[PDB]
Symmetry: D3
Subunit: 249 residues, 6 copies
């Protein structure tokens, strides 16, 4: 798929396994990983030999959120900021529109973008000790990357607002209770792969159209709020509140 | 309301009891049951002597889904196909816009369309051992009849995706917890009747307009996706995948 | 500073505003003044930059018991007042949906009718152990237009919204939190809501206010689809024999 | 034919249906029976596979002069007839918006009030040289709810729709065509709309029917946004003194 | 007046209100005081039961020649004023959209930028023979977010709304009526608008006000869809070096 | 931009000239031109050095629509059909979301997909004796390319309905009278290039943000009906009506 180092795509028949691949840095999102995720979904859509994906992270985390270095660049580099905003748009719309089922295997913390990738998936398996969180607000940023943007399709709006506003950690058990996750698994990668291979035996036209039927609701909610969210996040990158916090850490 | 035998309608004052009536086939859907459902909602809306309904199934099930013979005919006959699509649309739009409250008494399995009727009701009572399921995808069909379509109004979209794609049976308890049903009942038809009867004592104009206020959301969601959904299921009927799954399922010697 | 009447006390504590529904003797029931004040408050908070967060609660044992029977009787008899209350009813919903600052509810006691709609329109909700939510509009001959059943489908299953709205069932604190109609049960909801708002106040402003906005776009889209219909239908129920007859019994206080 | 009343004549001519509003002594003003007919018709057309296209027109000199004053005074005095008429008005609008077959309008004379709404809901419109469109709801103390102004923004500037709905301006045949409220000025709108429909009849059915649905999605979204409120507000009109007073004189 | 600043005169003539932008020396260009008054007024019109129709026009030669340059210059430097002018910008748009009474514009001279937006947001528009409409936002480094181009798609072709919001080209009185941006060309548009509003005053209140809401539902939907994005972007525009450059030149 | 031969892209500073390139065939649409078109718009969005585009056709026509051999192929080939549908969607979604202003130089007939691309552009110049037309229906296909689908944003729904159903040729003068085009031109290509050039001088963030504000209204329309529309054009590739008409052509 012409991915970079930080995104390993492996082929097993009509399955694709996607592994976020910065395990030493807990899959924190740098420019390279970000651009990779922007491009990947349309590519899956356009490859007829792919019929399903699994997304997971290498090592202990799914993704711990933004890379501090990447973040500090974003607050001083306008060209980089404009590109990240385009790509950000393409991840959300890439996954919203993606042809094939995507099964998430949350092996570890999924924070920020990680947490948004999980809300944009079709079925989610999560490890007992893993959690979801979005700490955008606590760090000085509008949560635009897809988490809070998509959470009201999954949970109550009250709950969405509280977790977006305060960076609440959502445990594996709680996420399943809420419908932010489908199953707690001991081995979420394995359980994910078996659910995707199960889906691969089903009639293709039926599988692909039914995902599109449901994702229309997702796409409606995205077109309503995404341009404003991205625009506002862009303004937050240049706030003293953000610049200060992202310098300390 | 000029229903065919497979939809029994009983009046009890201002109440209508709607019983799906092919009990020996687990009330599975044939053309007559389908057509009747398509016409029924508008005729209730226009009968000012009706102000509430209960819908249930005769015998052990609420509805086991499509009659395999009906489904096989649908893969072969383009005219019948186009008809079923029109009538399917009318069931969904018909319920969405139905003037009177509709209380489901799910007496056993509500599968495929049955499960969609339950999603389009206002209040659901469900028996302890009944379940909800939509096995459209397992069988080669796009789930358009109104279940998965409207499930996201009741439940997490992630959970709607999973159940639409895997055809999981949803127990009465799991359903009540999820908000796909309202109460578990020893006698769901008795409890539905009582529920509807309380609603009949209440001021009509408040009851009717308040349903309308809440169903606008349902209508907004259906308008976004029903046409596409129906067109896709129209194509599903003609696929080799579906022909081969249904030609086995309909082969009964 | 916000030209509120007696029936809405508003208190400043730094950048926090504490809003108290203030008719304790009537269990904070809605009369015209309380309705007008609620209509005008939210824009005035948005425009006060010294304000950055708000807590809303009730004086005495109740959050709000809903409609003042005297007022409701007057509404079934006065077409001018009716048209005004519809206008102000749109402003409460629109004002809260569009309000710049996070609003945390402290449901100290029953939140009924307009009461529970103010709750459904808040951002974070703390509820007392013995408090409950209810909307008895339909039992009383009125369409539930206030913002309750109107907004409920964004928190809970539509099936459940249809039941609770058609029957007026009471939703206990434990049940509300189980359902997503509230965030937390509290021994002391006012203290807990105040601490929650004060914790938010420490967060970067532009991030908090923008994030409320992103989330409330979904709420505004839902309100815009049904609000004018809902309020127009409620207008009509004030003039029904059903309501006129029910509200005459209720407004009969010797 | 379709169990219509006398007030609505439906004629078949192969796969075409010709719908003629039928109270020419009253300029096809709308009474209850015509109104109920209009609500039932479209779903029945939709459900008749031997029907593939419609033309709609008026008997005699008018297309339709709008609201029969007898009906309207009756509507102002009886809550149950109000509730039924709102219910049916809803069905006319959704009926035509959801209708399977192409509907071609032949506007033979004035199309006023509801009649002008029938035109806006049609797919192609031929209008006689001397004919006009108007919606007089407001000047009569009624909210303009039953499809006209409600639908006009899909045809014309919102500014123009607002002015015409508030002032009840007459829109001439030429002027209708200049705005896109009508497709062609016709000497014989009945005949020209009949040939239009026969032309569409020869085209591939599935292409024709699906294309209508594609464009009417935009119509349906605009209606769904506003119809419930407009009908509710018009129900309130029937009951005001301003209306009771104006309709008494008329 | 209605607590308007001097920059907005409101005169009462029975149930009628005449709203007059009142900085003729600067051709009614938009400063901060005018902007605030425009934000506050609409809700106050809606809440005054003794008002039932309104006309809006400009003192002197122009209806309004868009932003005061001095004002736009502050907006490039003061962040608090920026956030405030964005808040009130929403209120002009949402307040006009939701306003109870019909509003009839008398475009007596050029309506530029915000002026052109107030016209788009009106119910019925009368325009002088030598007047015109324009939005030069883009030529000046600003996103056109005030409610002009935001709203133009409900009146005209999207292709045309794009041409004019991009090129900033002027729309003559005659061309505006032809497109659907104006209702009537007038010799004396103040007088034609006043007469139009008076006719409307004679009509049954409930029918007028409801019919306005029915139609404005479409404007409200179009605004909700793009306003928050639009104002956020125009906000980013104010801090751009393109705008700082352009505006510093124009105010010196 | 890795574009096929059938789509020429030329650079002139920040300008991109897009010339549809099958002149001997009146730039009629085959699979490769179709794939090129689907892939183009995101690549333009992502090339920061492109800031405006002009689209036109080589030779005497803008585009005469579907390639007959291509359409016959589509009637008989399941996979080719599903692919053309995916790409058709990207053409529409790519144009609607394209960052940069696109100016159309309609140099001759723009028929079918031709007038759909015109409909999706932001400013249009049309030559004196050119016309817009969509004959999808008369050949047996639901008019889903984006033409009729976009028209109600430009013109009365009544006229859209008529032009779509009857395949009416819309003259250059009528197109401008309705606002299906902006100007009649002696040399549409020069006037377009000059207009695009004028735009390139304007402040970029104002230009690009303003396009987005406006195209949100386009994107709302497209999202409401595109999937139904593309699914119905798929069903019509498979009708006897279409097969007969295409085969005898
Ligand atoms: Ca982010
Ligand atoms: Ca039978
Ligand atoms: Ca039979
Ligand atoms: Ca089915
Ligand atoms: Ca109320
Ligand atoms: Ca009427
Ligand atoms: Ca501006
Ligand atoms: Ca095509
Ligand atoms: Cl495989
Ligand atoms: Cl919408």
């Amino acid at each position: 798929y012409d991915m970079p180092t930080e995104i390993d795509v492996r082929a097993d028949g009509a399955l694709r396994i996607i592994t976020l691949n910065r395990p030493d840095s807990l899959n924190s999102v740098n420019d390279d990983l970000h651009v990779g995720l922007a491009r990947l979904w349309q590519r899956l859509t356009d490859d007829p030999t792919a019929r399903a994906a699994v997304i997971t992270g290498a090592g202990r985390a799914f993704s711990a959120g933004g890379d501090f270095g990447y973040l500090k660049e974003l607050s001083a580099d306008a060209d980089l900021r404009a590109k990240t905003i385009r790509d950000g748009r393409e991840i959300v719309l890439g996954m919203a529109r993606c042809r094939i089922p995507v099964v998430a295997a949350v092996n570890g913390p999924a924070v920020g973008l990680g947490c948004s990738l999980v809300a944009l998936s079709d079925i989610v398996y999560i490890a007992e000790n893993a959690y979801l969180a979005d700490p955008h607000v606590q760090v000085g940023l509008v949560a635009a990357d897809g988490g809070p943007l998509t959470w009201p399709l999954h949970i109550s709006l009250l709950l969405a607002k509280e977790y977006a506003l305060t960076g609440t950690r959502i445990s594996a058990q709680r996420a399943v209770e809420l419908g932010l996750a489908n199953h707690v698994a001991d081995d979420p990668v394995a359980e994910a792969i078996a659910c995707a291979k199960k889906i691969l035996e089903l009639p293709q036209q039926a599988v692909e159209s039914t995902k599109r039927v449901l994702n229309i609701h997702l796409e409606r909610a995205v077109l309503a709020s995404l341009d404003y969210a991205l625009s506002a996040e862009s303004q937050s990158f240049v706030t003293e509140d953000f610049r200060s916090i992202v310098t300390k850490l």
